[PDB]
Amino acid sequence: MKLTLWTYEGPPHVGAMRVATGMTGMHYVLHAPQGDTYADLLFTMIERRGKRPPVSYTTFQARDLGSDTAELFQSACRDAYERFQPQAIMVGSSCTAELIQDDTGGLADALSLPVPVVHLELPSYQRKENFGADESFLQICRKLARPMERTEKVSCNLLGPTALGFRHRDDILEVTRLLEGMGIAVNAVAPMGASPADIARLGAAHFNVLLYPETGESAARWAEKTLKQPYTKTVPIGVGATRDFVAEVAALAGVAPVADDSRLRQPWWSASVDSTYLTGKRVFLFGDATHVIAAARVARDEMGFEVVGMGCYNREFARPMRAAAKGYGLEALVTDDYLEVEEAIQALAPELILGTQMERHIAKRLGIPCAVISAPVHVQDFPARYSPQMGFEGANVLFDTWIHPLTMGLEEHLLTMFR
Amino acid sequence: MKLTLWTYEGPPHVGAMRVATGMTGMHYVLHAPQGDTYADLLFTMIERRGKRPPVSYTTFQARDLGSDTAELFQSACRDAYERFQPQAIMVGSSCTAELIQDDTGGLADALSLPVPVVHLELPSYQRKENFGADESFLQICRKLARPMERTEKVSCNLLGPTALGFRHRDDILEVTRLLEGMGIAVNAVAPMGASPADIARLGAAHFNVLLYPETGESAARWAEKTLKQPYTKTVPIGVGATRDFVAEVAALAGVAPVADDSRLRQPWWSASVDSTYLTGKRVFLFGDATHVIAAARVARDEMGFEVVGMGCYNREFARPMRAAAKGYGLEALVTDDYLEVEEAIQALAPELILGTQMERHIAKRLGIPCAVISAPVHVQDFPARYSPQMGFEGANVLFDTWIHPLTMGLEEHLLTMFR
Amino acid sequence: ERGQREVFCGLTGIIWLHRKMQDAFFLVVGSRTCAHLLQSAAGVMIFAEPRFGTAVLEEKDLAGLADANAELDREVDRLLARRPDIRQLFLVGSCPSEVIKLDLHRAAERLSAHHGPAVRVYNFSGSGIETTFTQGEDACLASIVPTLPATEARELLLVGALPDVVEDQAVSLLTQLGIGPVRCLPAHHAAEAPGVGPNTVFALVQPFLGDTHGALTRRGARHIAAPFPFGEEGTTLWLKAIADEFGVSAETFEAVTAAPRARARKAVAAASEGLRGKSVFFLPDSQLEPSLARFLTRECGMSAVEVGTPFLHRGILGPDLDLLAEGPVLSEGQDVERQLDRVRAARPDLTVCGLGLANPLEAEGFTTKWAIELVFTPVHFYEQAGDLAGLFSRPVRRRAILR
Amino acid sequence: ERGQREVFCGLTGIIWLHRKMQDAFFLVVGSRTCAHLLQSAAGVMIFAEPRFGTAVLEEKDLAGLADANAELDREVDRLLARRPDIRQLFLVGSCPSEVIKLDLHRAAERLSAHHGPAVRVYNFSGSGIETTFTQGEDACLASIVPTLPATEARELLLVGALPDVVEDQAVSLLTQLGIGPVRCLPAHHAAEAPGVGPNTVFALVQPFLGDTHGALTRRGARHIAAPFPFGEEGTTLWLKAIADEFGVSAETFEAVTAAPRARARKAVAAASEGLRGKSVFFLPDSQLEPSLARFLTRECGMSAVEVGTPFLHRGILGPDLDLLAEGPVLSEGQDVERQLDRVRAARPDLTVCGLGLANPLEAEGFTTKWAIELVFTPVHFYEQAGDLAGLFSRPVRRRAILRR
Numbered sequence A, B: 001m002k003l004t005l006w007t008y009e010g011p012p013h014v015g016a017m018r019v020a021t022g023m024t025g026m027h028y029v030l031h032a033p034q035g036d037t038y039a040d041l042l043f044t045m046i047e048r049r050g051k052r053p054p055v056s057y058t059t060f061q062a063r064d065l066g067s068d069t070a071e072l073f074q075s076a077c078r079d080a081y082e083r084f085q086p087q088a089i090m091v092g093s094s095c096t097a098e099l100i101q102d103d104t105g106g107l108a109d110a111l112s113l114p115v116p117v118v119h120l121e122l123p124s125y126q127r128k129e130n131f132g133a134d135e136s137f138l139q140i141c142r143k144l145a146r147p148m149e150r151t152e153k154v155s156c157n158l159l160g161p162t163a164l165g166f167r168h169r170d171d172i173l174e175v176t177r178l179l180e181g182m183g184i185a186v187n188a189v190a191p192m193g194a195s196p197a198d199i200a201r202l203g204a205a206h207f208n209v210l211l212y213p214e215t216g217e218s219a220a221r222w223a224e225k226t227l228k229q230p231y232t233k234t235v236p237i238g239v240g241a242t243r244d245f246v247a248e249v250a251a252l253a254g255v256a257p258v259a260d261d262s263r264l265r266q267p268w269w270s271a272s273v274d275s276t277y278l279t280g281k282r283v284f285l286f287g288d289a290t291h292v293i294a295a296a297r298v299a300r301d302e303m304g305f306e307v308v309g310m311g312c313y314n315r316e317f318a319r320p321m322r323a324a325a326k327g328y329g330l331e332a333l334v335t336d337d338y339l340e341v342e343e344a345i346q347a348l349a350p351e352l353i354l355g356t357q358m359e360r361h362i363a364k365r366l367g368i369p370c371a372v373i374s375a376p377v378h379v380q381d382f383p384a385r386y387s388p389q390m391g392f393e394g395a396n397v398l399f400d401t402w403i404h405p406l407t408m409g410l411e412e413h414l415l416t417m418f419r
Numbered sequence C: 001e002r003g004q005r006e007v008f009c010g011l012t013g014i015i016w017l018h019r020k021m022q023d024a025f026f027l028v029v030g031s032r033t034c035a036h037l038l039q040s041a042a043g044v045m046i047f048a049e050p051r052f053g054t055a056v057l058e059e060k061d062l063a064g065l066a067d068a069n070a071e072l073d074r075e076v077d078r079l080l081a082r083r084p085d086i087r088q089l090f091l092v093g094s095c096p097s098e099v100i101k102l103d104l105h106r107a108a109e110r111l112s113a114h115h116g117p118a119v120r121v122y123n124f125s126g127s128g129i130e131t132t133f134t135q136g137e138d139a140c141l142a143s144i145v146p147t148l149p150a151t152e153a154r155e156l157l158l159v160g161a162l163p164d165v166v167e168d169q170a171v172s173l174l175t176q177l178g179i180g181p182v183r184c185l186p187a188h189h190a191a192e193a194p195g196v197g198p199n200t201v202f203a204l205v206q207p208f209l210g211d212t213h214g215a216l217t218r219r220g221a222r223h224i225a226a227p228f229p230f231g232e233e234g235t236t237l238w239l240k241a242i243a244d245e246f247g248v249s250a251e252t253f254e255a256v257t258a259a260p261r262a263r264a265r266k267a268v269a270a271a272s273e274g275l276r277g278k279s280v281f282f283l284p285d286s287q288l289e290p291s292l293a294r295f296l297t298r299e300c301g302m303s304a305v306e307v308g309t310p311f312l313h314r315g316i317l318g319p320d321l322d323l324l325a326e327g328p329v330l331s332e333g334q335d336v337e338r339q340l341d342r343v344r345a346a347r348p349d350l351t352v353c354g355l356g357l358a359n360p361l362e363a364e365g366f367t368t369k370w371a372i373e374l375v376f377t378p379v380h381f382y383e384q385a386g387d388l389a390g391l392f393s394r395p396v397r398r399r400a401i402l403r
Numbered sequence D: 001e002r003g004q005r006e007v008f009c010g011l012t013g014i015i016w017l018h019r020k021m022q023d024a025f026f027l028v029v030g031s032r033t034c035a036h037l038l039q040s041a042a043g044v045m046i047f048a049e050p051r052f053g054t055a056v057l058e059e060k061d062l063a064g065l066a067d068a069n070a071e072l073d074r075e076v077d078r079l080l081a082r083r084p085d086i087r088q089l090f091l092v093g094s095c096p097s098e099v100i101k102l103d104l105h106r107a108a109e110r111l112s113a114h115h116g117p118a119v120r121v122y123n124f125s126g127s128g129i130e131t132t133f134t135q136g137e138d139a140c141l142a143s144i145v146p147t148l149p150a151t152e153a154r155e156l157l158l159v160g161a162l163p164d165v166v167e168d169q170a171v172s173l174l175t176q177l178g179i180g181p182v183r184c185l186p187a188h189h190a191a192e193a194p195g196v197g198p199n200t201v202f203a204l205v206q207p208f209l210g211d212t213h214g215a216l217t218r219r220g221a222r223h224i225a226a227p228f229p230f231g232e233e234g235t236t237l238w239l240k241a242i243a244d245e246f247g248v249s250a251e252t253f254e255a256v257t258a259a260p261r262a263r264a265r266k267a268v269a270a271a272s273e274g275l276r277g278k279s280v281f282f283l284p285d286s287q288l289e290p291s292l293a294r295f296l297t298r299e300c301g302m303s304a305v306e307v308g309t310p311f312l313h314r315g316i317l318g319p320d321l322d323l324l325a326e327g328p329v330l331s332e333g334q335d336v337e338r339q340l341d342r343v344r345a346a347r348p349d350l351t352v353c354g355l356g357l358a359n360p361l362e363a364e365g366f367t368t369k370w371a372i373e374l375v376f377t378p379v380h381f382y383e384q385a386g387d388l389a390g391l392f393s394r395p396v397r398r399r400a401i402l403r404r
């Protein structure tokens, strides 16, 4: 037992709900106690979705226990099919439903629904939200994605973007523009903007692009084995990472590496004399492992910052996290306790903190310039404006976002000196 | 002899200098005292320009008067021709050179340089930097733009954008995207993207698009008389003004409207329940008249704010400013003095202030949420990221930028109550 | 009537209770789902180090009941070492803690034995399997009630957790009226816990304290059944019903409550301009819907179409139901899909719904106002009657402005 | 070379002067250009409501010295109506004011006749055709000098506007030297103004104060030429010259100064990691370039390829030039294109140039430091020797090895 006040990741069913919400025509009939409908507010509020999350809840009570729970689940699935008319059903359990002995997949199969039904086996007490999303995307691919003849032209699959993801929407657009500039069409983006029909055509792509390993690594590996689809190991966050991604994607596709640097201003604006004070600014970095590794490379190579802190809350990416941290000469802080991150920041006293909203709130009470780079965020952090973190426009956004706290601090400091 | 600490506008030579650094192949040979080269710093640091401004100064001293100072002017223009080798030379004088009796135009004719030479007589003490930019652009158009055959396909001129302009680069990009989505190519962008050849081709466009009246209205009214090119009277800031602009551009061009709404997010994120508290929040507005008039419509018709203060520092647009403020039940504050706007803010005590950089600092002293909407800005108010204020993506940027101070104040208040 | 219930477990009321009781910690024996709910509902509160936490269960904790109890004991010891300022620990139940049959009553008695009397460990259930939203506050108060000391005095008990400014207005108005002692059951500190006896008489402030009403009735307290203090008329009738139990005559009542009534009526009229002549739909969130639909119908001139509550306690909402017009139909059974269909058919001008249902209804074209704000914001008594009207008015004002 | 010069008019001297003189308000009689320059170079200070304003010359102000002077008196009286805190007013001359031939020396006398006991109005010319950059500061100081009272006691005298921390540490080290009470001409308030006489021998802390040096020589005070306190060695020889003039024993001086010299040497060595064996170019910005080149070349090991100074006062800078190696090429006069070609050909590893020139040279691939920062940030004496070294250590050349 551990007393937790802040969780970087929710329960796995929240990740499965993210997969269902990003996808269209996909419904999640979740066996949950009455009052577990709470995570719908995350999608309706944080992401401002004009459509209610495609999730049906049994919402069983104390009276509905034992024999009544299975009947409640079966009625929930059949009524969800009758009402929403989805093209594929996910069935899953909450922590409470995992505790009770109803077999969700067995009931769903017993209903014999016309559309494919995906059985979700997410251990809720030992795993977390990103595992839920990754495993849900996996099982959807296994159920629906099959070996398919490849497109006549070179085509790609954007794998990883799930709902409630940090700037996934704008990253999709930026990577799509990159690939189109190369001459590579995006066959399907999944889970966001996907359908069971699109999961069916996932086998038609010549190669996969794993934008977000946290929510798509299992699906990318499965496609590698069955669908014979190699997936990119480079996440295009930052100029150097974007150019490595350009070269790797061009090699996989067979097209010449072409990228548009015309709107790219991060290198010149870091080379300018105004950015000289940024040299040697110690930075602490925390959040999801992919974003932390990418942001550490951006900071050191393109910003003149010295990385004094580096960590992640995904134990699934501990080995990549430690391997990346060794490159900067530090030991990665792989933990899910915000107290440990606070202790590390206090013992480290970074000049700038790049991380989650928890790290953006630890900095304020310590009076440290802060910016958000990772998944746990607020409604404010989801922007109406185009705010990619990937590609060259994402590099410009990263420059402005990371420099804004330092510029503000310097301006307020000068104002205080001038009284 | 009014004691001035902050000027909202520089001397007219600064605006003419913005026009010069906007174009390529146009050099500003300025008759100026030594030490008047300070405005080069504005272009090299504020806008973060890679190359030196196309400005050559005489930098006379007290030992050089009478025949000498004219000789330094001759040497400056000749040296500019020899080493800078511009396609066109434009000659002006500063305040001090305006006082001394040296005819800028006559000496240029005496040189008989092959490149076209335009003389801008800008009243330094009567007028200001926006008039300087407008009159410089008008003189450049008069000398180089000539009637020509219309382009085969429908094309437009983006008239107004200059260097040091607020969001001019990203607004150029956004309006260009909006017109290409509409089937109208951009014949030229003047003077920020233009050249003496492009200024010559200005007459080829079917119509002009007056992006910024402050700097482009004189050239638009001249091109509506000599090149017979009507200009759009609406500036596309905000959703409603963007639709008005699309309608007028379709009417002028004859093409279908075809507005690309798919990436619009301002309407929904303003209609969402998270923006309910925005209703009835009082906003004070100051800045150049175009941006203030557009931002008032955005704040009222699109964000639920009530406008309690509406004003401009640009007295050239006094009639449009007052006419706009009359529609909101207000008296327009047409003043060049920042103490007057300070008094207006203190009297009104708004909940949000949208203005220039001095407006932002007045708000910060007064503890009122503030966002910058107008031309006088810092280096920090020139983003590397794509930050249009115009068009549909400009609407999203506007929503995020205007809402960020309110969100940050609300969050700070909530944290203060909680802790 | 039975189906998907888009509500919150009563672990949500813990957020208000930790704000109203500064010496109370709310330890939640639940899973990562319940901790995630707590942080999502708290929002900014979690960043201020609040006084509620979740002891997340592990697989070994589900397997071993004795092991889980020992680990809970260790966690409680570490909590009290970490936060000595806590004087009352609230071991709240949860859905998993119920399924594992983790008897929190035994743990509460044991920890009260070993950590007594420095910290008093009470047990109540916030499980959504049993409770819902404000039923968490009701369960907390009903768990507080049995341990209250006995008294022989004639004391008025102001049952209900209120914002400090609203509670201050309450006690000020009551003292001006001429009543005797006023105490609040959700006391700020454990030392200020009121006493309940046969002569004790209590008045309900929030229309969801049914189990608290029963627990106080078991101790011999008597209920002052009054319309709940929402708006000018609601506050007036609340104070009048308390006065009739305390002997305050019409002359003193009108010499005390005339000024606040007069200003509150004007404030409501000014802040309810667009509400007049508009229908309002209520979906079951917080059981505030009938006692506040009465305010909207009578004061603001709204024409309520349907009032939905998680469950009616007709006994404590009797006067407020009586003041309701016969026109609105009231529903206690919640199936979110059927209720959304009813909302679509009715096409209400305003739709008081939950946070999850708000944005989709706004996208469909229905103005909505989340009822969670009503519980968090001060909307009680006289000063906030205008704020109460403006809470429902500003969505309609925004809809009119934005179109 | 007489060509285009990219240097600031001396009204920029006001910007850092008023931070040291908290009693003085500087009123500039100029056009819109001078007010715009003043606000642009001030930056955030103008938002912080500072003590410099520009009495903008209007078209009606251009004609008529009597009328314009009357409006000037109106504005000055209005300003002391707003600002009774200030006792010093500086009628800073500007280029349009000089062209108008608007006598501001007369105006200072008239305003001193009006409210002399209440306000002491000084007068100097920060005009561009007359004065360049820190020549504004030294012109203001030289204007202050003649009004200063005479004294008959030999006291150590400090000339130059310095940050309060730097001034405090300088007077602290001078006191641990033991001989010679100190005094600073740019006093924070006119009440604590110094007494200047023939006996008070004055030491100059910043090179560009040549007009102030001349004005102090008119008073009878003689100058002790010394290398200016930039880095460990320059500060050491400055203090050694001061001690020798006051007869402080060599062993006592070395013993008292050893610790800060050691700390400064450690700090300059730590900062000068990428500076050794490097080439530095100086464009004429602030007249600090000779002492800058001395410090860099000797302590930092950075060979100077060209030292450019807008005005080289050889008499005062003589010890510093003696300390400087023969290799650096000192140049007088500024033609921006000639010096740009010179830096392009020399391919320097660092170029200490103006801010209007810094970013273009970075675009061309040259590492640039802007010397306008130097007059702002504390770069004097041991306690700031490390910061001074690191300021040239990472104006790129620590970012170049990071960007490229």
Ligand code: SF4
Pocket: A033, A034, A035, A036, A095, A096, C008, C009, C010, C011, C030, C031, C033, C034, C035, C037, C093, C094, C095, C096, C126, C127, C128, C129
């Ligand atoms: S409904 Fe049950 S499992 Fe879900 S958050 Fe509430 S107490 Fe926890």
Ligand code: SF4
Pocket: B033, B034, B035, B036, B095, B096, D008, D009, D010, D011, D030, D031, D033, D034, D035, D037, D093, D094, D095, D096, D126, D127, D128, D129
């Ligand atoms: S003093 Fe002369 S050179 Fe300096 S800003 Fe004024 S006009 Fe320009």
Ligand SMILES: [Cu+2]
Pocket: A405, A408
């Ligand atoms: Cu901020």
Ligand SMILES: [Cu+2]
Pocket: A408
């Ligand atoms: Cu900010």
